[PDB]
Design an enzyme around this catalytic site. Structure first.
Site, PDB file in Angstrom:
ATOM      1  N   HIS A 204       0.874  -1.204   0.000  1.00  0.00           N
ATOM      2  CA  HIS A 204       0.000   0.000   0.000  1.00  0.00           C
ATOM      3  C   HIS A 204       0.899   1.238   0.000  1.00  0.00           C
ATOM      4  CE1 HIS A 204      -3.047   2.848   2.099  1.00  0.00           C
ATOM      5  NE2 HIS A 204      -3.355   2.801   0.799  1.00  0.00           N
TER       6      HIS A 204
ATOM      7  N   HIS B  48      -2.446   0.881   7.708  1.00  0.00           N
ATOM      8  CA  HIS B  48      -3.890   1.029   7.388  1.00  0.00           C
ATOM      9  C   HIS B  48      -4.595  -0.325   7.512  1.00  0.00           C
ATOM     10  CE1 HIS B  48      -1.417   4.100   5.213  1.00  0.00           C
ATOM     11  NE2 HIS B  48      -2.200   4.903   5.951  1.00  0.00           N
TER      12      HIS B  48
HETATM   13  S1  FES Z   1       0.750   0.967   4.292  1.00  0.00           S
HETATM   14 FE1  FES Z   1       0.086  -1.042   4.840  1.00  0.00          FE
HETATM   15  S2  FES Z   1      -2.111  -0.818   4.901  1.00  0.00           S
HETATM   16 FE2  FES Z   1      -1.435   1.132   4.049  1.00  0.00          FE
END
Ligand code: FES
Ligand SMILES: Nc1nc2c(c(=O)[nH]1)N[C@H]1C(S)=C(S)[C@@H](COP(=O)(O)OP(=O)(O)OC[C@H]3O[C@@H](n4cnc5c(=O)[nH]c(N)nc54)[C@H](O)[C@@H]3O)O[C@H]1N2
Ligand SMILES: Nc1nc2c(c(=O)[nH]1)N[C@H]1C(S)=C(S)[C@@H](COP(=O)(O)OP(=O)(O)OC[C@H]3O[C@@H](n4cnc5c(=O)[nH]c(N)nc54)[C@H](O)[C@@H]3O)O[C@H]1N2
Ligand code: HEM
Ligand code: F3S
Ligand code: FES
Ligand SMILES: [Mo+4]
Ligand SMILES: [O]
Lengths: 843, 102, 132, 132
Positions: free
Chosen positions: D62, D81
């Site tokens: 992500h 997140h």
């Molecule tokens: S950086 Fe891992 S869930 Fe967004």
């Protein structure tokens, strides 16, 4: 113009895994290899680092083995991992000599890829109609439903209530394993009468005529096209439709390249470069290619009227006989000498629907067939001097009184042409009379469609003539329909009416199943049977994509095609090859033969539970776990010379395989048969070929003359070089759909101007049978009043305007179709980018 | 040198055959050549511009031949051998050393 | 390194082009034979003031046979296996055995009218990388 | 070169690994963090004699937060997140904001027992090429 913008392909490494691949598609069966390697490995530009042992940092010259186009490259699943794959023509295959057609060269990009997003239309799961739309389910669930409805209906109304449409062909969507599996289920376990084949609406031969005469239709080799004095090509467009047989074997003959091999193999007679007669009402790119390689002098394009081949052939036969341009010793030694009486209804009708032609001696046939040059000229609209010259090119001896060698080739211009049984016979008469069967440079052969891969139990129960299955369905008969690897919605005759009724009948079963509880299966089954009893139809489709007829079906089962499975088939030379699996079935798809075995196993269980163990026991013998099990139960046990053929032995022989039938096995080599009937003993009880007393009787199929008389245009129909069959793969291939988003209808520029039509316009073709649409393609070479529409095409189905008219043996007379043409709309904007120039190559 | 004329002949072989058996293809067989006449070979269909340039009287001497393999097109305007023609004149000389055999 | 890096090569000047006469060119190196061509009409990929100047690889994408131009129909024609390409419509195979439309050049006309090739839209015959 | 060229890097020996305890590792160079993990059951991309040794990028696809390992669930967990990745199912995102499943290593065990990584099946976070 569609461009891939692929600037660069992965190099096949030195240690890539090699797989023998026969082309998925047409009869020619061009040899290929599939090279696969890990997704995270690649080949180097240096010789030691790629598969070719060549320095790839340097431009390669014309006809290089050390190149492949983007369409030959993909990424696919193999043993559940992504691998690179290149599917390349084999330079060392005697068939193609490393040629690949526009079709076979895109095997790789018409493969299923999650990674490169190719052919995402491919079926991954069983689908069942429930909850008001198609819904994915398990195999166990789908097969249980199919078997419970099938078992109930045949138990209650007999096997005659089960209707089957199925492939009988080789290659992808066919082959020895898959014809055996379907054949064993419907002809061994059951006695299904009401079965039709993928291209014709009854269980019949395309060519009863040649076969009744004792001449199997694939009796020569591809070399004979190189060795003939004259080639007679009848209703074939071989450059588009049998491409690399034409390019790798006919062309060398017409150009003289063949002369050296001729002289080596047949000294003791003269040899000039090959000449060619082309019997086709339409000037094709095949006529052009022949003119351009052998000169107009050496090419006789007989532009006959539609469906008059039989008149032409009877006149050639008459003329050749009257001159004594015949192999007297062949006739006396190898053909039927005994006189036999004409049937009572001759010459209008045969002795029966079963036997529309009269088999006889040379002399009885000549007198029966007897037609003047003047009369054939009237019927064919040819000039006397064309017919006489055609006679001379076939019959007249060479210098030392030596026999002229003539390979006679035909396909669907004859087979889907007027009076199939008699026309087929009249052509065999010419090859028989001139001793051009079982000799080098000879043959009277189908040029073919699919590869061949047929092995099934006896079909004796089916009868001759067999059931006209489409008429049973349109007339509201049958309860359950199993459809394997065909799409009548695009490819059957009288297709408009077929669709009208097929939709109403499947709609009745759909409404019932939407209204009934699924999770209680017995209530679902009873609602289906009650709907069938009101005149509904339960339809099961076995395919690789969502078909057009599949939009009417209640169950879809997903099949794995060639390359996702081992597959055996033979070409128009009887050249048998193993296609070796190089990739995984998409999702849960399974080979057709293993679907048949699984349905058989489910039939056994359901019938045992209903308390009929005796019927259930008929569905044993289906314990196959792999396609090889189907090969060994089928081809190995039942094919002529099958005991000599295994996967292992076939693998060792590569893309050249061996010609059927196999005679023995000697040190890692299956021994085969280069030519049939070399000993002059034919496929009849006494070993004599019969001639055919085959008199002209006009357009013999019901209503055809009426359709010609009451409509303005001939709607000739057949193949495009770019399009494979009904565009089942092509419809998700930007390269093909960029070229023809609509099916073209070839029209004379003067005919278009008189009808207010311009290039690209969308036009309705309509007549007594129905209506359809195509895009007008201006064709200078087209004769006035005579159009050609691409067949089987999803975005405009030519079959809609073909009548229900068949010959006595239920052969569909597709090619003799007439209709009117009116405008629907101006050229759609999506045709603006299309080229409308001639397909004819210019020197 | 004729050794690296065989390498340059890779650009002809598609249309032209040479050696034992060599038959006519898209182009006529090129056996002998040095001492053969223009529009020479029996069987091949030469253009109305390659027939017209045999009428006047020609041979394939090494100076007439250098002009052809360099710019076939406008040098014999109307020739069926449309093709760039070898641009390096030392390669024109190599492939003709290969042609010197056969 | 992710894409092929295309040289910006000088091919000709707009002044060097005669209406309907192919000018023989090589791009992106010596061994990649092609042509420039003025068509006297506005077409796909066309450059210059009339937008009628196109550039194409002229080696058949089927089997590497050199193609030939017909001035009457404005088509490339392959004497190998009878393929026809339409350089008025982006080099679409009008009929043929290639699985590719004719590889076409990305042309730029500088102020002096010098014509440049900056890339190719299809894989050139006989190289597994358009830049070797 | 049409493909990324992956080095064949030694990372550990089979004998260095405890059941269900990740070993910190890096591939294809030292700035791309990852782990080797012996799961004790046969799994997708799982090498070794039990087929249970897997290797993964441990940087969240992500926005690149490093992932913790949950010994109880055998899952990777992103504190960024709240994304969750399943090393027993080829790194399938159970739940999360990444548009990719967890980048996984093509592992080879040698006869001596050394573990080499020879590739990665998805783009590693924070590089536009897996080999920089
Ligand atoms: S950086 Fe891992 S869930 Fe967004
Ligand atoms: N008017 C007119 N009509 C004609 C003709 C004509 O000349 N004129 N020609 C006739 C002839 S010669 C023919 S061959 C027929 C063709 O008629 P069809 O057989 O209906 O046409 P195809 O496109 O070959 O259909 C093949 C189907 O099998 C599916 N398939 C492919 N591979 C597999 C596989 O491995 N397993 C399964 N289960 N399915 C698979 C494809 O997705 C597709 O739906 O058309 C006939 N119709
Ligand atoms: N590119 C390509 N090749 C294919 C196929 C494909 O879909 N695409 N399909 C394969 C299959 S299944 C088949 S069956 C074959 C079909 O191969 P062909 O039969 O060669 O092809 P068609 O285009 O159906 O028809 C051949 C010719 O018959 C002519 N014809 C029409 N009416 C008459 C008539 O009354 N008399 C005569 N003498 N000729 C007539 C047509 O003008 C046409 O040129 O092609 C095979 N190969
Ligand atoms: C280095 C490469 C080539 C060489 C050295 C070569 C050499 C020749 C020579 C010497 C002739 C004239 C000989 C005669 O009149 O008998 C000729 C004619 C011809 N060549 Fe080639 N050639 C080459 C490549 C090609 C290619 C690539 C093609 C086609 C794509 C081709 C097609 C022809 C044709 C059609 C003619 C006949 C000309 C006419 O009829 O007007 N050649 N070539
Ligand atoms: S490549 Fe395939 S389509 Fe026919 S001509 Fe050769 S078999
Ligand atoms: S090389 Fe041009 S058509 Fe085959
Ligand atoms: Mo067919
Ligand atoms: O067929």
């Amino acid at each position: 113009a569609f461009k891939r913008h692929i600037d660069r392909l992965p190099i096949i490494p030195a240690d890539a895994k090699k797989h023998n691949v026969t082309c998925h598609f047409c009869i020619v069966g061009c040899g290929y290899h599939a090279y696969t390697w890990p997704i995270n490995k690649q080949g180097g530009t240096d010789p030691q680092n790629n598969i070719f042992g060549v320095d790839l940092s340097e431009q390669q010259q014309a006809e290089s083995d050390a190149w492949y186009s983007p369409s030959m490259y993909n990424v696919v699943k193999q043993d559940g991992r992504d691998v690179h794959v290149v599917i390349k023509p084999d330079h060392e295959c005697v068939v193609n000599s490393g040629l690949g057609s526009v079709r076979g060269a895109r095997m790789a990009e018409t493969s299923f890829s999650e990674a490169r997003n190719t052919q995402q239309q491919r079926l991954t799961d069983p689908l069942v109609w429930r909850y008001g739309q198609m819904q994915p389910t398990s195999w166990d669930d789908a097969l249980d439903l199919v078997a419970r409805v099938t078992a109930k209906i045949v138990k209650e109304k007999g096997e005659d209530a089960l209707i089957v449409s199925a492939f009988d062909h080789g290659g992808a969507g066919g082959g020895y394993e898959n014809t055996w599996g379907t054949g064993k289920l419907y002809f061994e376990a059951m006695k299904v009468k009401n079965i039709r084949i993928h291209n014709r609406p009854a269980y019949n031969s395309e060519v009863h005529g040649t076969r009744d005469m004792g001449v199997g239709e694939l009796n020569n080799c591809y070399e004979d096209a190189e060795l003939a004095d004259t080639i007679v090509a009848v209703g074939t467009n071989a450059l588009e439709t049998q491409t690399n047989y034409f390019l790798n074997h006919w062309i060398p003959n017409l150009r003289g390249e063949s002369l050296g091999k001729k002289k080596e193999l047949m000294p003791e007679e003269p040899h000039e470069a090959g000449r060619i007669i082309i019997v086709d009402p339409r000037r094709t790119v095949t006529v052009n290619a022949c003119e351009q390689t052998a000169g107009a002098d050496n090419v006789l394009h007989l532009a006959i009227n539609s469906g008059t081949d039989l008149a032409l052939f009877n006149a050639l036969f008459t003329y050749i006989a009257d001159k004594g341009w015949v192999d007297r010793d062949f006739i006396d030694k190898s053909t039927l000498r005994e006189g036999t009486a004409r049937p009572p209804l001759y010459p209008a009708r045969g002795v029966s629907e079963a036997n529309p032609g009269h088999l006889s001696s040379f002399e009885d046939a000549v007198e029966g067939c007897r037609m003047s040059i003047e009369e054939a000229a009237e019927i064919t609209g040819l000039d006397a001097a064309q017919i006489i010259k055609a006679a001379e090119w076939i019959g007249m001896p060479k210098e030392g009184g030596k026999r002229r060698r003539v390979m006679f080739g035909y396909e669907k211009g004859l087979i889907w042409g007027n009076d199939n049984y008699r026309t087929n016979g009249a052509l065999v008469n010419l090859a028989l009379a001139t001793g051009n069967i079982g000799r080098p440079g000879g043959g009277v052969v189908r040029l073919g469609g699919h590869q061949e891969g047929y092995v099934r139990p006896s079909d004796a129960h089916v009868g001759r003539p067999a059931a006209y299955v489409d008429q049973l369905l349109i007339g509201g008969q049958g309860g359950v329909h199993h459809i394997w690897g065909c799409d009548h919605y695009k490819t059957t005759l009288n297709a408009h009416e077929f669709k009208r009724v097929y939709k109403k009948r499947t709609d009745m079963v759909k409404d019932a199943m939407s209204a009934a509880p699924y999770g209680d299966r017995e209530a679902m089954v009873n609602a289906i049977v009650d709907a069938i009893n009101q005149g509904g139809l339960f339809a099961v489709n076995v395919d690789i994509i969502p078909t057009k007829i599949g939009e009417a079906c209640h169950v879809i089962l997903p099949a794995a095609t060639s390359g996702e499975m081992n597959l055996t088939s033979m070409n128009g030379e009887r050249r048998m090859r193993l296609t070796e699996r190089y990739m995984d079935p998409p999702g849960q798809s399974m080979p057709d033969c293993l679907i048949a075995a699984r349905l058989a196993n489910t039939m056994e269980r359901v019938l045992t539970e209903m308390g009929d163990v005796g019927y259930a026991a008929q569905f044993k013998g289906f314990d196959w776990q792999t396609e090889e099990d189907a090969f060994m139960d089928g081809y190995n046990k039942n094919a002529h010379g099958g005991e000599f053929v295994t996967y292992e032995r076939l693998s060792a022989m590569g893309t050249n395989g061996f010609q059927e039938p196999a005679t023995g096995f000697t040190d890692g080599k299956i021994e085969g048969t280069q030519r049939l009937y070399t000993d002059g003993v034919f496929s009849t009880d006494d070993g004599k070929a019969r001639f055919m007393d085959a008199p002209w009787r006009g357009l013999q199929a019901p209503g055809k003359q009426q359709q010609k008389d009451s409509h303005k245009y001939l709607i000739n129909n057949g193949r495009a070089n770019v399009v494979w069959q009904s565009a089942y793969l092509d419809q998700e291939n930007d390269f093909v759909m960029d070229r023809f988003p609509y099916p073209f209808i070839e029209m004379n520029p003067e005919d278009m101007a008189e009808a207010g039509l311009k290039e690209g316009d969308l036009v309705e073709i309509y007549n007594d049978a129905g209506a359809t649409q195509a895009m007008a393609y201006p064709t200078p070479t087209a004769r006035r009043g005579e159009t050609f529409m691409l067949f089987g095409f999803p975005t405009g189905v030519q079959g809609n305007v073909t009548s229900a008219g068949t010959n006595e043996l239920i052969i569909p007379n597709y090619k003799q179709t007439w209709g009117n043409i009116r405008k629907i709309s101006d050229a759609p904007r999506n045709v603006a980018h299309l080229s409308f120039k001639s397909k004819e190559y210019q020197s | 040198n004729a050794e690296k004329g065989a390498v340059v002949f890779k650009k002809c072989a598609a249309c032209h055959a040479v050696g034992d058996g060599a038959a006519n293809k898209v182009g006529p067989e090129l056996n002998g050549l040095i001492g053969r006449k223009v529009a020479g070979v029996e069987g091949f269909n030469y253009s109305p511009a390659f027939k017209a340039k045999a009428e006047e009287g020609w041979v394939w001497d090494e100076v007439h031949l250098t002009e052809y393999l360099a710019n076939p097109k406008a040098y014999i305007k109307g020739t069926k051998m449309a093709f760039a023609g070898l641009k390096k004149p030392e390669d024109v000389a190599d492939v003709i050393a290969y042609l010197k055999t056969f | 390194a992710a894409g092929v890096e295309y040289p910006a090569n000088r091919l000709a000047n707009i002044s060097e082009l005669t209406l309907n006469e192919p000018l023989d060119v090589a791009y992106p190196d010596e061994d990649a034979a092609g042509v420039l061509l003025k068509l006297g009409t506005r077409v796909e990929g066309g450059v210059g003031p009339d937008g009628d100047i196109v550039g194409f690889s002229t080696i058949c994408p089927h089997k590497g046979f050199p193609l030939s131009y017909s001035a009457d129909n404005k088509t490339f024609n392959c004497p190998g296996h009878f393929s026809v390409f339409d350089p008025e419509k982006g080099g679409q195979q009008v009929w043929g055995q290639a699985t590719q439309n004719l590889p076409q050049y990305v042309l730029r006309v500088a102020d002096n009218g010098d014509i440049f090739a900056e890339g190719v839209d299809e894989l050139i015959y006989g190289r597994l990388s358009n830049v070797l």
